[PDB]
CSV table of C-alpha atoms and ligand atoms in Angstrom, one decimal:
chain,number,residue,atom,x,y,z
A,1,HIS,CA,16.5,-0.1,2.8
A,2,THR,CA,15.2,2.9,0.6
A,3,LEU,CA,12.4,5.4,0.2
A,4,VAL,CA,11.5,7.9,-2.0
A,5,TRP,CA,12.4,11.6,-1.6
A,6,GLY,CA,10.1,13.4,-4.4
A,7,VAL,CA,9.8,13.4,-8.2
A,8,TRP,CA,11.1,15.5,-11.0
A,9,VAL,CA,8.8,16.5,-14.1
A,10,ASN,CA,10.8,16.7,-17.4
A,11,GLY,CA,14.1,17.3,-15.4
A,12,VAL,CA,12.5,20.0,-13.1
A,13,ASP,CA,12.9,19.0,-9.3
A,14,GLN,CA,9.1,19.1,-7.6
A,15,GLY,CA,10.8,19.5,-4.2
A,16,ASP,CA,10.5,17.3,-1.0
A,17,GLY,CA,7.3,15.2,-1.3
A,18,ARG,CA,7.5,13.2,1.6
A,19,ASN,CA,4.1,13.1,3.5
A,20,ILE,CA,3.3,15.7,0.7
A,21,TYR,CA,2.5,14.1,-2.4
A,22,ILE,CA,4.4,10.8,-1.5
A,23,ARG,CA,2.2,8.4,0.9
A,24,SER,CA,5.4,7.7,2.9
A,25,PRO,CA,6.2,5.1,5.4
A,26,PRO,CA,7.6,6.1,8.5
A,27,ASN,CA,11.0,4.1,7.7
A,28,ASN,CA,12.8,1.9,4.9
A,29,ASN,CA,12.0,-1.2,6.1
A,30,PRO,CA,10.8,-3.7,3.4
A,31,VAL,CA,7.3,-5.2,3.1
A,32,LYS,CA,7.5,-9.0,3.0
A,33,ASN,CA,4.2,-10.1,3.6
A,34,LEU,CA,2.6,-10.9,0.2
A,35,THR,CA,-1.0,-11.2,1.5
A,36,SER,CA,-0.7,-7.7,3.6
A,37,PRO,CA,-2.5,-4.4,2.8
A,38,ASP,CA,1.1,-3.1,3.1
A,39,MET,CA,1.7,-4.5,-0.6
A,40,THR,CA,-0.7,-1.5,-1.7
A,41,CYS,CA,1.6,1.4,-0.8
A,42,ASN,CA,3.7,0.3,2.2
A,43,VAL,CA,2.6,0.8,5.9
A,44,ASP,CA,1.0,4.2,5.7
A,45,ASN,CA,-1.5,4.2,3.0
A,46,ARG,CA,-3.8,7.4,3.1
A,47,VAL,CA,-4.5,10.6,1.1
A,48,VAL,CA,-1.7,13.0,1.5
A,49,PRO,CA,-2.3,16.8,0.9
A,50,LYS,CA,-0.9,17.2,-2.8
A,51,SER,CA,-0.9,15.6,-6.3
A,52,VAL,CA,2.0,16.5,-8.8
A,53,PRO,CA,0.7,18.1,-11.9
A,54,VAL,CA,1.8,16.4,-15.1
A,55,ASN,CA,0.5,15.7,-18.7
A,56,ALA,CA,0.5,12.7,-21.0
A,57,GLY,CA,4.1,12.5,-22.6
A,58,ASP,CA,5.8,14.0,-19.4
A,59,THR,CA,8.9,12.3,-18.0
A,60,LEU,CA,7.9,11.7,-14.4
A,61,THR,CA,11.4,10.7,-12.6
A,62,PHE,CA,11.2,8.8,-9.2
A,63,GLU,CA,14.0,10.0,-6.6
A,64,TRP,CA,15.0,7.3,-4.0
A,65,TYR,CA,17.3,7.7,-0.9
A,66,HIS,CA,18.6,5.5,2.0
A,67,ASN,CA,19.3,7.9,4.9
A,68,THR,CA,19.9,11.2,3.1
A,69,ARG,CA,18.6,12.4,-0.1
A,70,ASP,CA,21.5,11.6,-3.1
A,71,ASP,CA,23.5,9.4,-0.4
A,72,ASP,CA,24.1,5.9,-1.6
A,73,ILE,CA,20.3,5.2,-2.1
A,74,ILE,CA,20.0,1.3,-1.5
A,75,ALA,CA,22.5,-1.4,-0.3
A,76,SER,CA,24.7,-2.9,-3.1
A,77,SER,CA,23.2,-6.3,-1.7
A,78,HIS,CA,19.8,-5.6,-2.6
A,79,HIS,CA,20.2,-7.0,-6.4
A,80,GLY,CA,16.5,-7.1,-8.1
A,81,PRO,CA,14.2,-5.9,-10.6
A,82,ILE,CA,12.1,-2.5,-10.6
A,83,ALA,CA,8.4,-2.0,-11.8
A,84,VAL,CA,6.1,1.1,-11.8
A,85,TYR,CA,2.2,0.7,-11.8
A,86,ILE,CA,-0.7,3.1,-12.1
A,87,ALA,CA,-3.9,3.2,-10.7
A,88,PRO,CA,-7.0,5.6,-10.4
A,89,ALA,CA,-6.7,7.5,-6.8
A,90,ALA,CA,-10.5,6.5,-7.0
A,91,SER,CA,-9.6,3.0,-6.2
A,92,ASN,CA,-7.1,4.0,-3.2
A,93,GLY,CA,-5.3,1.0,-4.3
A,94,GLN,CA,-8.1,-1.4,-3.6
A,95,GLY,CA,-9.4,-4.1,-6.1
A,96,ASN,CA,-8.1,-5.1,-9.7
A,97,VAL,CA,-6.7,-1.5,-10.3
A,98,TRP,CA,-3.0,-1.9,-10.8
A,99,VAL,CA,-1.6,-1.3,-14.3
A,100,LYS,CA,2.2,-2.0,-15.1
A,101,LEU,CA,3.9,0.9,-17.2
A,102,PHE,CA,7.5,-0.4,-16.6
A,103,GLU,CA,9.6,-3.7,-16.0
A,104,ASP,CA,13.4,-3.8,-15.7
A,105,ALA,CA,15.2,-6.9,-14.1
A,106,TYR,CA,18.7,-7.5,-15.6
A,107,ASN,CA,20.7,-5.9,-18.6
A,108,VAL,CA,22.8,-8.7,-20.1
A,109,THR,CA,25.0,-6.2,-22.0
A,110,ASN,CA,26.2,-4.1,-19.0
A,111,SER,CA,25.4,-7.3,-16.7
A,112,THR,CA,23.6,-5.0,-14.1
A,113,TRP,CA,20.3,-5.4,-12.1
A,114,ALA,CA,17.7,-2.4,-12.3
A,115,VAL,CA,18.6,-1.8,-8.6
A,116,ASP,CA,22.5,-1.6,-9.5
A,117,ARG,CA,21.9,1.1,-12.1
A,118,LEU,CA,19.4,2.8,-9.7
A,119,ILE,CA,22.4,3.5,-7.4
A,120,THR,CA,24.6,4.5,-10.5
A,121,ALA,CA,21.6,6.8,-11.3
A,122,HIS,CA,21.6,8.7,-7.8
A,123,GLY,CA,18.2,7.0,-7.1
A,124,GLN,CA,16.4,8.3,-10.4
A,125,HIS,CA,14.2,6.2,-12.6
A,126,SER,CA,11.3,7.4,-15.0
A,127,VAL,CA,8.4,6.6,-16.9
A,128,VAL,CA,6.7,8.7,-19.5
A,129,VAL,CA,3.2,9.7,-18.4
A,130,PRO,CA,0.6,7.6,-20.4
A,131,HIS,CA,-2.4,9.2,-22.6
A,132,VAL,CA,-4.9,8.1,-19.9
A,133,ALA,CA,-8.2,10.1,-19.0
A,134,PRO,CA,-7.1,13.5,-17.3
A,135,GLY,CA,-7.7,13.0,-13.5
A,136,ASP,CA,-5.9,11.7,-10.2
A,137,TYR,CA,-3.7,8.8,-10.0
A,138,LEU,CA,-1.1,6.8,-7.8
A,139,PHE,CA,2.2,5.8,-9.3
A,140,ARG,CA,3.8,2.8,-7.4
A,141,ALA,CA,7.3,2.5,-8.0
A,142,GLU,CA,8.4,-1.2,-6.5
A,143,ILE,CA,11.8,-2.4,-6.0
A,144,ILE,CA,12.0,-6.1,-5.5
A,145,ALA,CA,15.3,-6.9,-3.5
A,146,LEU,CA,16.0,-10.7,-3.8
A,147,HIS,CA,19.3,-11.0,-1.6
A,148,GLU,CA,17.3,-13.2,0.8
A,149,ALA,CA,14.6,-14.4,-2.0
A,150,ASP,CA,16.0,-18.0,-1.9
A,151,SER,CA,13.4,-18.8,0.9
A,152,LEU,CA,9.7,-17.7,1.2
A,153,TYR,CA,8.6,-15.2,3.8
A,154,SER,CA,5.4,-17.4,4.4
A,155,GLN,CA,7.7,-20.4,5.5
A,156,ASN,CA,10.6,-18.4,7.1
A,157,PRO,CA,9.6,-15.1,8.2
A,158,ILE,CA,13.3,-14.0,8.6
A,159,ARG,CA,14.1,-14.3,4.8
A,160,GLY,CA,11.7,-13.9,1.7
A,161,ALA,CA,11.5,-11.3,-1.3
A,162,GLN,CA,11.6,-7.8,0.0
A,163,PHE,CA,9.3,-5.0,-1.3
A,164,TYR,CA,10.3,-1.1,-1.6
A,165,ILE,CA,7.1,0.1,-2.4
A,166,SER,CA,6.0,4.1,-2.7
A,167,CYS,CA,3.1,5.6,-4.0
A,168,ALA,CA,3.3,9.0,-5.4
A,169,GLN,CA,0.1,11.0,-6.1
A,170,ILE,CA,-0.1,12.6,-9.7
A,171,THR,CA,-2.6,14.7,-11.4
A,172,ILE,CA,-2.7,14.0,-15.2
A,173,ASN,CA,-4.1,17.7,-16.7
A,174,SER,CA,-3.7,17.4,-20.2
A,175,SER,CA,-4.2,14.1,-22.1
A,176,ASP,CA,-6.1,13.2,-25.4
A,177,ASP,CA,-7.1,10.2,-23.5
A,178,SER,CA,-5.8,8.1,-26.7
A,179,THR,CA,-5.3,4.8,-24.3
A,180,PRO,CA,-7.8,4.7,-21.9
A,181,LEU,CA,-6.4,2.9,-18.4
A,182,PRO,CA,-7.8,-0.8,-18.3
A,183,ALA,CA,-8.5,-2.6,-15.2
A,184,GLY,CA,-5.2,-4.2,-13.5
A,185,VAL,CA,-4.2,-6.4,-10.9
A,186,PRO,CA,-4.7,-6.1,-7.0
A,187,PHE,CA,-2.0,-5.7,-4.4
A,188,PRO,CA,-2.2,-7.5,-2.0
A,189,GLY,CA,-3.0,-10.2,-4.4
A,190,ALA,CA,-0.9,-10.4,-7.8
A,191,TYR,CA,2.2,-11.8,-6.1
A,192,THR,CA,1.8,-15.4,-4.4
A,193,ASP,CA,4.6,-18.0,-3.1
A,194,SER,CA,4.3,-19.7,-6.6
A,195,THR,CA,4.5,-16.5,-8.9
A,196,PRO,CA,7.8,-16.4,-10.7
A,197,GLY,CA,10.4,-13.9,-9.6
A,198,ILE,CA,9.3,-14.2,-6.1
A,199,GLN,CA,11.4,-17.3,-4.9
A,200,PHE,CA,14.9,-17.2,-6.7
A,201,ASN,CA,18.6,-17.4,-5.8
A,202,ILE,CA,20.7,-15.1,-7.3
A,203,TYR,CA,23.6,-16.8,-5.4
A,204,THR,CA,23.2,-20.2,-7.5
A,205,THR,CA,21.3,-19.4,-10.6
A,206,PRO,CA,22.6,-16.9,-13.4
A,207,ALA,CA,20.6,-13.6,-13.5
A,208,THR,CA,19.9,-14.1,-17.4
A,209,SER,CA,17.5,-16.9,-16.3
A,210,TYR,CA,15.8,-14.5,-13.8
A,211,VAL,CA,11.9,-13.7,-15.0
A,212,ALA,CA,10.2,-10.9,-13.2
A,213,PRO,CA,7.0,-11.2,-11.7
A,214,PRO,CA,3.7,-10.7,-14.0
A,215,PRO,CA,1.9,-9.0,-15.0
A,216,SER,CA,3.0,-7.7,-18.5
A,217,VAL,CA,3.7,-4.0,-19.3
A,218,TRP,CA,0.4,-2.7,-20.5
A,219,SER,CA,0.6,-1.9,-24.4
A,220,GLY,CA,-0.4,1.7,-23.6
A,221,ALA,CA,2.7,2.0,-21.6
A,222,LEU,CA,5.2,4.8,-23.2
A,223,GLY,CA,8.4,2.9,-21.6
A,224,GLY,CA,10.9,4.7,-19.2
A,225,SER,CA,14.6,4.2,-18.1
A,226,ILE,CA,17.1,4.3,-15.1
A,227,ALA,CA,19.3,7.2,-15.3
A,228,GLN,CA,19.9,10.7,-13.6
A,229,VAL,CA,17.8,13.4,-15.0
A,230,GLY,CA,19.0,16.2,-12.6
A,231,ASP,CA,21.4,17.1,-9.6
A,232,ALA,CA,19.9,17.3,-6.6
A,233,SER,CA,23.3,18.4,-5.2
A,234,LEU,CA,22.3,22.0,-6.6
A,235,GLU,CA,19.6,23.1,-4.3
B,301,LIG,O1,25.2,-9.8,1.0
B,301,LIG,C1,24.8,-11.3,0.7
B,301,LIG,C2,24.2,-11.5,2.1
B,301,LIG,O2,23.1,-10.4,2.5
B,301,LIG,C3,22.6,-11.0,3.4
B,301,LIG,O3,21.7,-9.7,3.6
B,301,LIG,C4,22.3,-8.8,4.8
B,301,LIG,C5,22.2,-7.4,3.5
B,301,LIG,O4,23.2,-7.9,2.7
B,301,LIG,C6,22.5,-6.2,4.1
B,301,LIG,O5,22.7,-5.1,3.1
B,301,LIG,C7,21.6,-5.9,5.2
B,301,LIG,O6,21.5,-4.7,5.8
B,301,LIG,C8,20.6,-4.2,6.3
B,301,LIG,C9,20.5,-4.1,7.8
B,301,LIG,O7,20.0,-5.5,8.0
B,301,LIG,C10,19.3,-3.5,8.4
B,301,LIG,O8,19.0,-3.4,9.7
B,301,LIG,C11,19.6,-1.6,8.2
B,301,LIG,O9,18.7,-1.1,8.6
B,301,LIG,C12,18.8,0.3,9.1
B,301,LIG,C13,18.8,1.3,7.9
B,301,LIG,O10,19.8,0.7,6.6
B,301,LIG,C14,19.1,2.6,8.0
B,301,LIG,O11,18.9,3.4,6.8
B,301,LIG,C15,18.0,2.9,9.2
B,301,LIG,O12,17.9,4.3,9.5
B,301,LIG,O13,18.0,2.2,10.4
B,301,LIG,C16,17.8,0.9,10.0
B,301,LIG,C17,17.3,0.0,11.4
B,301,LIG,O14,18.9,-0.6,11.9
B,301,LIG,O15,19.9,-1.5,6.6
B,301,LIG,C18,20.9,-2.6,6.1
B,301,LIG,C19,20.9,-2.4,4.5
B,301,LIG,O16,20.8,-1.0,4.2
B,301,LIG,O17,21.5,-7.1,6.4
B,301,LIG,C20,21.4,-8.4,5.7
B,301,LIG,C21,21.5,-9.1,6.9
B,301,LIG,O18,20.2,-10.1,6.6
B,301,LIG,C22,21.6,-12.2,3.3
B,301,LIG,O19,21.1,-12.7,4.7
B,301,LIG,C23,22.5,-13.5,2.8
B,301,LIG,O20,21.7,-14.2,2.3
B,301,LIG,C24,23.4,-13.0,1.7
B,301,LIG,O21,24.4,-13.9,1.5
B,302,LIG,C1,0.3,-11.6,6.6
B,302,LIG,O1,-0.7,-10.5,6.7
B,302,LIG,C2,-1.9,-11.1,6.7
B,302,LIG,C3,-3.1,-10.1,6.3
B,302,LIG,O2,-3.0,-8.6,7.1
B,302,LIG,C4,-2.1,-11.4,8.1
B,302,LIG,O3,-3.3,-12.1,8.5
B,302,LIG,C5,-1.1,-12.6,8.6
B,302,LIG,O4,-0.9,-12.9,9.7
B,302,LIG,C6,0.3,-11.9,8.3
B,302,LIG,N1,1.5,-13.1,8.2
B,302,LIG,C7,2.3,-12.7,9.2
B,302,LIG,C8,3.4,-13.9,9.3
B,302,LIG,O5,2.2,-12.2,10.0
B,303,LIG,CL1,18.1,-6.6,4.8
B,304,LIG,CU1,17.3,-3.3,2.8
């Protein structure tokens, strides 16, 4: 159970974005129905009034929270991977438009899931803004919590993989457009009961054997990280 508070650009807090530049849901309940329109940008998908200004090569940091900003972020039980997708705001999330910029499941070294490191990062994880066409974009941050993903929602509607999905409105101003954005996958649509990483038992199976859902990270992606970039408590 977790939501996005707002974003930092190159370590600069852009302020509360909820229902302003984040298409926020009315609460932190997970999305579980893989076929639902709710898979696109969560249960409250509509153009909100603002879009954050960035340029190619900027560091965009999502900040998540549980009850209050900079609290415990997400329950320690919600072990899982973290992904970030981009689509043209054009699409409004519809069609084969979602392009993956970032994937992080399990770090063998530290033996932490992405979600574990997000809690440590005070809810902060980042992507470097790719060199796509200047214009208006949605950045879709997705946390998959697997604490009940041993079942499928379609077979047992009180269990299943849990999706914490937040779409940010981002306007890319300066970019040489050296990596034009290809077509991508639909949400709903890319995840089905058979897709790897959707049904998995973190209780019986080792986290090294975990394989996050497709698609693969676009070669145009400039990577990212899970780690605090700024102090919310100084505001
Ligand atoms: O831990 C292994 C065990 O986990 C079982 O699943 C547990 C989760 O572990 C636990 O974290 C989860 O707690 C939920 C709780 O159900 C929610 O109702 C509550 O929702 C609150 C919310 O947190 C508030 O922020 C908001 O204001 O109000 C809502 C509405 O009440 O959020 C917490 C997590 O933050 O509960 C699960 C029980 O199903 C697995 O079932 C089991 O298989 C595992 O072995
Ligand atoms: C999942 O969402 C689809 C499309 O909105 C809907 O028809 C279906 O009834 C939902 N499944 C459940 C269990 O509600
Ligand atoms: Cl839960
Ligand atoms: Cu939860």
